[PDB]
Amino acid sequence: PKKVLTGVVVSDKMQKTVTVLVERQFPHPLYGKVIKRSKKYLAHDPEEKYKLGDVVEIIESRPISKRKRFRVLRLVESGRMDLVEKYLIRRQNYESLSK
Amino acid sequence: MVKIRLARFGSKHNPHYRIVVTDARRKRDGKYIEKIGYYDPRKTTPDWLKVDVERARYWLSVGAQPTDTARRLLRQAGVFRQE
Amino acid sequence: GRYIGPVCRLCRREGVKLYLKGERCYSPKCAMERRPYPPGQHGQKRARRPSDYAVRLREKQKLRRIYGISERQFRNLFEEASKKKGVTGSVFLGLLESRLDNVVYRLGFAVSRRQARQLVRHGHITVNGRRVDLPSYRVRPGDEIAVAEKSRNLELIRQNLEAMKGRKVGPWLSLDVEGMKGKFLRLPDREDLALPVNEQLVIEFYSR
Amino acid sequence: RNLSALKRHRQSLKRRLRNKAKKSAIKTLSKKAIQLAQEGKAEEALKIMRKAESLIDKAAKGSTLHKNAAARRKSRLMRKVRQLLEAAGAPLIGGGLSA
Amino acid sequence: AYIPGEGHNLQEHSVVLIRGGRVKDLPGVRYHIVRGVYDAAGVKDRKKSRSKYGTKKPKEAA
RNA sequence: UGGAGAGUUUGAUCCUGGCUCAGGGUGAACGCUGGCGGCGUGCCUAAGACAUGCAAGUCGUGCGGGCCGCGGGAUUUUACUCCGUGGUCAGCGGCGGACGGGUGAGUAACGCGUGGGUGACCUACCCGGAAGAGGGGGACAACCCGGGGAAACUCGGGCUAAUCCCCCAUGUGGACCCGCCCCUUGGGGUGUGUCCAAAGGGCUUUGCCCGCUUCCGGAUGGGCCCGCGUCCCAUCAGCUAGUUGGUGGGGUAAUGGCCCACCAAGGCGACGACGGGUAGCCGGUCUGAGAGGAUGGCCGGCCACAGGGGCACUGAGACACGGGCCCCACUCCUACGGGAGGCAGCAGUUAGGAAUCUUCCGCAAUGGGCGCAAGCCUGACGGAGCGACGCCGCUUGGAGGAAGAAGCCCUUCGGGGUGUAAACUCCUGAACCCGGGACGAAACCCCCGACGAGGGGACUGACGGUACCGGGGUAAUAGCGCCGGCCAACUCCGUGCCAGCAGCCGCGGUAAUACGGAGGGCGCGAGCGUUACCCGGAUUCACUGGGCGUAAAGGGCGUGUAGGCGGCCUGGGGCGUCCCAUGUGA
Numbered sequence A: 001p002k003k004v005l006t007g008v009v010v011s012d013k014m015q016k017t018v019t020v021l022v023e024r025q026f027p028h029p030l031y032g033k034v035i036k037r038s039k040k041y042l043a044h045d046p047e048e049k050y051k052l053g054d055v056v057e058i059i060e061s062r063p064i065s066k067r068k069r070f071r072v073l074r075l076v077e078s079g080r081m082d083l084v085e086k087y088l089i090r091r092q093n094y095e096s097l098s099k
Numbered sequence B: 001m002v003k004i005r006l007a008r009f010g011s012k013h014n015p016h017y018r019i020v021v022t023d024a025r026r027k028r029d030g031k032y033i034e035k036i037g038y039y040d041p042r043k044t045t046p047d048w049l050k051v052d053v054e055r056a057r058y059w060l061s062v063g064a065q066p067t068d069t070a071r072r073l074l075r076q077a078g079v080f081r082q083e
Numbered sequence C: 001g002r003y004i005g006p007v008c009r010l011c012r013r014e015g016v017k018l019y020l021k022g023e024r025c026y027s028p029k030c031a032m033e034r035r036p037y038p039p040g041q042h043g044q045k046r047a048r049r050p051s052d053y054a055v056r057l058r059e060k061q062k063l064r065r066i067y068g069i070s071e072r073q074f075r076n077l078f079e080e081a082s083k084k085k086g087v088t089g090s091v092f093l094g095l096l097e098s099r100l101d102n103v104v105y106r107l108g109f110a111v112s113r114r115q116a117r118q119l120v121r122h123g124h125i126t127v128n129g130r131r132v133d134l135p136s137y138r139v140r141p142g143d144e145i146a147v148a149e150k151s152r153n154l155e156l157i158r159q160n161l162e163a164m165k166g167r168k169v170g171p172w173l174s175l176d177v178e179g180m181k182g183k184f185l186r187l188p189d190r191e192d193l194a195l196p197v198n199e200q201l202v203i204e205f206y207s208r
Numbered sequence D: 001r002n003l004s005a006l007k008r009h010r011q012s013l014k015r016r017l018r019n020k021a022k023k024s025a026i027k028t029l030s031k032k033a034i035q036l037a038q039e040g041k042a043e044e045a046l047k048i049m050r051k052a053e054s055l056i057d058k059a060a061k062g063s064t065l066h067k068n069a070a071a072r073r074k075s076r077l078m079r080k081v082r083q084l085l086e087a088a089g090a091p092l093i094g095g096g097l098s099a
Numbered sequence E: 001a002y003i004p005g006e007g008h009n010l011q012e013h014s015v016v017l018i019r020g021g022r023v024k025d026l027p028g029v030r031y032h033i034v035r036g037v038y039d040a041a042g043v044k045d046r047k048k049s050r051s052k053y054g055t056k057k058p059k060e061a062a
Numbered sequence F: 001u002g003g004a005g006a007g008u009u010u011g012a013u014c015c016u017g018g019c020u021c022a023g024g025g026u027g028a029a030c031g032c033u034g035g036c037g038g039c040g041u042g043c044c045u046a047a048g049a050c051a052u053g054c055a056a057g058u059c060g061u062g063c064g065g066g067c068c069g070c071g072g073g074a075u076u077u078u079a080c081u082c083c084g085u086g087g088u089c090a091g092c093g094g095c096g097g098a099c100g101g102g103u104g105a106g107u108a109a110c111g112c113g114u115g116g117g118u119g120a121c122c123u124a125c126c127c128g129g130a131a132g133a134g135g136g137g138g139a140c141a142a143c144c145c146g147g148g149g150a151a152a153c154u155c156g157g158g159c160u161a162a163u164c165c166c167c168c169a170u171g172u173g174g175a176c177c178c179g180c181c182c183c184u185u186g187g188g189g190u191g192u193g194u195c196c197a198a199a200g201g202g203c204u205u206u207g208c209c210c211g212c213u214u215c216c217g218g219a220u221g222g223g224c225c226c227g228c229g230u231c232c233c234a235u236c237a238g239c240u241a242g243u244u245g246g247u248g249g250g251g252u253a254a255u256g257g258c259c260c261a262c263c264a265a266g267g268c269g270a271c272g273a274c275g276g277g278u279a280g281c282c283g284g285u286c287u288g289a290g291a292g293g294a295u296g297g298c299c300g301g302c303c304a305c306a307g308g309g310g311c312a313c314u315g316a317g318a319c320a321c322g323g324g325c326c327c328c329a330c331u332c333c334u335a336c337g338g339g340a341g342g343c344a345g346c347a348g349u350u351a352g353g354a355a356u357c358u359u360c361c362g363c364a365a366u367g368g369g370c371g372c373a374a375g376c377c378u379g380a381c382g383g384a385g386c387g388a389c390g391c392c393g394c395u396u397g398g399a400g401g402a403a404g405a406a407g408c409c410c411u412u413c414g415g416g417g418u419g420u421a422a423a424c425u426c427c428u429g430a431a432c433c434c435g436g437g438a439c440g441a442a443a444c445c446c447c448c449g450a451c452g453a454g455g456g457g458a459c460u461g462a463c464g465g466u467a468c469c470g471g472g473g474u475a476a477u478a479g480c481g482c483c484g485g486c487c488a489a490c491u492c493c494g495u496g497c498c499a500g501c502a503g504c505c506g507c508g509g510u511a512a513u514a515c516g517g518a519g520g521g522c523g524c525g526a527g528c529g530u531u532a533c534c535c536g537g538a539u540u541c542a543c544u545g546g547g548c549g550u551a552a553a554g555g556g557c558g559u560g561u562a563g564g565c566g567g568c569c570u571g572g573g574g575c576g577u578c579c580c581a582u583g584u585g586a
């Protein structure tokens, strides 16, 4: 099975590409507590159809660029700008950790 | 070219082979593809040679040259005996 | 090599009378009937309350010295009994009593385990017809333990097989006295033996 | 100190030489063909193309160009030619292209 | 390094094997010399723990 | 079927708490000691440098020669020349040299593990199935003639064969462009157009054997991609300009910023980017009641490397340990112009080091390359050699044998110990001597049959005159540590805070069970101790399983971001969770 993941488009700045943040969760190997973790995937959108906020599925794919190995299978639901806020703030916090 | 051959197991002054299918290129005692039998040349035990002939037949069916002595053991288990 | 050295001398020390000489360690002396105290200059002086360790040590030295076996071989047997199913105390004794050298002595062919050892070593014994010179050999049940036809004429085998005229043999053994051959019908339960040894202490000794 | 299968070295140089030439031909003729097609060329653009197609399939017979490296080159070539032709007039002398 | 034993034969260019084992009463002494090796001769007249100290079996009643 | 704790802070107590020990382990080393065998195991350091021999070739059934012989002819004039045949040499050509063997330097990486993906691919030899091989032409080494160099080698000229190379034909088929169907990433099909095949050799010679061509399928082996997993430092916090994406090319077997032109402004980071450190990863191994901790040596699997750095050629496959080119360093030759070399293959030498083997035997077996076969090659391998280095097995005797020798040691002077131990008496009979004597080996091959199935036949053993069997036969090695407590084992002398012991507590200052010796005792035993390292104990990094009022530990207090956590009722989804079946876990 070509791996199908699902997450949230958090960038459309590139041409024919969307960035998709994808959550995965699981027990911690020692401490057992279920923990979330995530990862961004660059996904191929040949028709710049998908935009900021969309939940999409993402599918394992024949390579399209360096580090672009996924295509956008389908829209799951639109909207979710809340989740994009989540990401964008987490991102600007970074500048408040320097010297 | 894949081969039915013998792989050496057992021990010093205690030879025990495995009739085995494997790529030619592979070291003699290394990863094989399938064990399809075993052979104890000193017949220490009443059962000193055994061969899954259905499987042997299969591997010959897909072009596997036996060792001359791999095929002597196979012959014996009526691998090529017909009708 | 197995112990080799003074014997009815731990007959002493270990408190109890151990039967390591057979004929004499049996009759107005295992040296023990004359001097029932430890060897050496201090032997007869108020013994000190023994430490839990001392106790457990002693019991295992007792059991081991009885069978004449070495610490390494004794130890491996214990570890083997521990892996195996069932009361690990008896099992060990099961295994210890399955040594050919012992069976031979249990069967009367020798008067001592030590002497039984020599019989087995020097080819005088045969398991299931085929002969066998390994004291450690595991006699399993069913096995016939004969004397070597060639060896029969010997004064020593004669006497011992003749003094087995009257004698009775453990419940796990049988013995055609004339054919100079016995059998190993099954392995002994703890109850079958009357050893002066609480194995619960031995298992305990091998716990730290 | 004289390992006689540095004969293999000798051979390699001769085979090298042979391949090297076969490929140079294919280059210069392909270039020639595409060049002709730039000026919208009757037979001669195809006539050449047609020669070069042969020279390719030929090279692929042996070790030179084996496979579909062959197919690749033919593909790149008789695409390029047909495209550059239809910039300007008809595929005159029908030569090597499916009607 | 500490030179263990009854007495010794070590002088200024001696060449010796070191083994580790602090001495505890002597600060900054974290190793012992091994006796019986290279130019540290083993302890003479030593009947008992002879294999530390490195002195061969004597031969009068043996 | 699995879980032990002790010593040490005080005058004493409880608690905290560190330290230390008892246990298991080893590719070891060092000391004392050392009898046998079987099976394992053996440069941890200098991925230092290397003498010498050996380590990948094979095919005359692809081709033509040279050289040394022998035989028969054309010849009866001895010049020329035809054929056959024995050695031998390379050359052309093929297939192999990409495997097998070595190593762990680098690598924190789709390197490795694990599970997937390839509509993004390749695969020589092998097996199956469909179809072919008809004309014609060319060159280059060998060989011959000349030239340069000291040598390594090299330049020029001339002839020649092939299964070497090329052109035309046939096109079962296949390739490409365009189109059309089906299918959906570049997967099938189909129509014009174009383009692409081939090699011969052997015969116990009209029919077989080895090959050659194109195509489809299988088998094996691989490439690429992806999810997840994979050590330490945050006293490394910001990193990036082929950078991130795009369009069009190039390159590949194939995807891809792999590379290039142009365009856009992007990509990554506290869920730890960037940097530094350290390290081949794994199956496993050691430890542990387990959870966990440590580890990756043997063996198997993958990677990476072949004096250091780059590079491409050939080829199914290499950017190629024993192939090529260039640069660097080191060694050797040199007629000073130039060359030669690469043991991390097997042995072996030297250096370093606490320390790690024979310049052995054999292709008999297994496996591998070429060969129709015979065979040839094979330091892969099978064996043997050496090291108690480890594991297991075995010996140094067995039964009698005194109120109890002597010597040595205690003593309360009566006695006690070593001690059935010895001496001595029977008994057995490791070593050693005599005899027989292996299994491992039935195939390749030859004959019958048909070169298939089946049957018959012959050869073949390094280990080895070994294992094993039979006859004879000698009482025939014991050591090391420990005895204050933890911990099993106590006394006499010597010694006097000395000499010394010492794992921790601590012993020694004239009665020391603690030092040294004696006797005696305890423990293991061809070993026993030591040092070093891992886990254990250590519930002393605490998930299982700990703590923070005074023992170490609550941030000086707030506000609040990310994050973590979330009251009661109903319904939907089924991500976590649970269950069944199945693939995988070599």
Ligand SMILES: NC[C@@H]1O[C@H](O[C@H]2[C@@H](O)[C@H](O[C@@H]3[C@@H](O)[C@H](N)C[C@H](N)[C@H]3O[C@H]3O[C@H](CO)[C@@H](O)[C@H](O)[C@H]3N)O[C@@H]2CO)[C@H](N)[C@@H](O)[C@@H]1O
Pocket (backbone or CB within 6 Å): F043, F046, F344
């Ligand atoms: N010559 C002794 C030493 O050899 C060392 O180098 C050794 C290593 O390169 C390699 O030895 C390997 C070793 O790497 C690796 N860990 C495997 C195995 N342990 C050794 O094996 C090597 O030596 C043994 C005999 O000692 C041989 O039997 C073996 O075939 C050989 N490969 O081969 C060399 C020995 O063969 C060092 N160069 C240096 O200290 C010194 O040369």
Ligand SMILES: NC[C@@H]1O[C@H](O[C@H]2[C@@H](O)[C@H](O[C@@H]3[C@@H](O)[C@H](N)C[C@H](N)[C@H]3O[C@H]3O[C@H](CO)[C@@H](O)[C@H](O)[C@H]3N)O[C@@H]2CO)[C@H](N)[C@@H](O)[C@@H]1O
Pocket (backbone or CB within 6 Å): F108, F109, F110
């Ligand atoms: N698809 C995921 C996999 O990514 C891996 O690469 C990832 C990991 O290697 C790495 O991330 C992991 C992180 O996921 C995990 N939660 C923490 C871990 N420390 C990180 O690891 C990183 O740091 C460690 C330590 O410095 C290093 O080994 C290395 O630099 C890197 N792996 O960086 C990448 C993203 O996390 C695999 N190498 C690759 O096989 C595969 O692509």
Ligand SMILES: NC[C@@H]1O[C@H](O[C@H]2[C@@H](O)[C@H](O[C@@H]3[C@@H](O)[C@H](N)C[C@H](N)[C@H]3O[C@H]3O[C@H](CO)[C@@H](O)[C@H](O)[C@H]3N)O[C@@H]2CO)[C@H](N)[C@@H](O)[C@@H]1O
Pocket (backbone or CB within 6 Å): F548
């Ligand atoms: N140490 C005292 C205080 O602990 C406080 O928090 C802790 C306490 O409130 C409380 O801990 C309790 C303890 O109160 C009370 N004495 C009984 C209980 N054994 C402890 O419980 C804790 O420890 C046990 C294991 O021992 C665990 O199984 C349990 O889950 C855990 N809560 O729960 C917290 C768990 O640590 C504060 N951190 C602070 O006031 C201070 O640290």
Ligand SMILES: [Mg+2]
Pocket (backbone or CB within 6 Å): C037, C038, C039, C040, C041, C042, C043, C044
């Ligand atoms: Mg006494």
Ligand SMILES: [Mg+2]
Pocket (backbone or CB within 6 Å): D005, D007
């Ligand atoms: Mg060749």
Ligand SMILES: [Mg+2]
Pocket (backbone or CB within 6 Å): F009
């Ligand atoms: Mg205090």
Ligand SMILES: [Mg+2]
Pocket (backbone or CB within 6 Å): F010
């Ligand atoms: Mg005190």
Ligand SMILES: [Mg+2]
Pocket (backbone or CB within 6 Å): none
């Ligand atoms: Mg404590």
Ligand SMILES: [Mg+2]
Pocket (backbone or CB within 6 Å): none
């Ligand atoms: Mg050996």
Ligand SMILES: [Mg+2]
Pocket (backbone or CB within 6 Å): none
């Ligand atoms: Mg030749």
Ligand SMILES: [Mg+2]
Pocket (backbone or CB within 6 Å): none
């Ligand atoms: Mg290799």
Ligand SMILES: [Mg+2]
Pocket (backbone or CB within 6 Å): none
């Ligand atoms: Mg090897």
Ligand SMILES: [Mg+2]
Pocket (backbone or CB within 6 Å): F108
């Ligand atoms: Mg790093």
Ligand SMILES: [Mg+2]
Pocket (backbone or CB within 6 Å): none
């Ligand atoms: Mg395949």
Ligand SMILES: [Mg+2]
Pocket (backbone or CB within 6 Å): none
């Ligand atoms: Mg021709």
Ligand SMILES: [Mg+2]
Pocket (backbone or CB within 6 Å): none
């Ligand atoms: Mg010429």
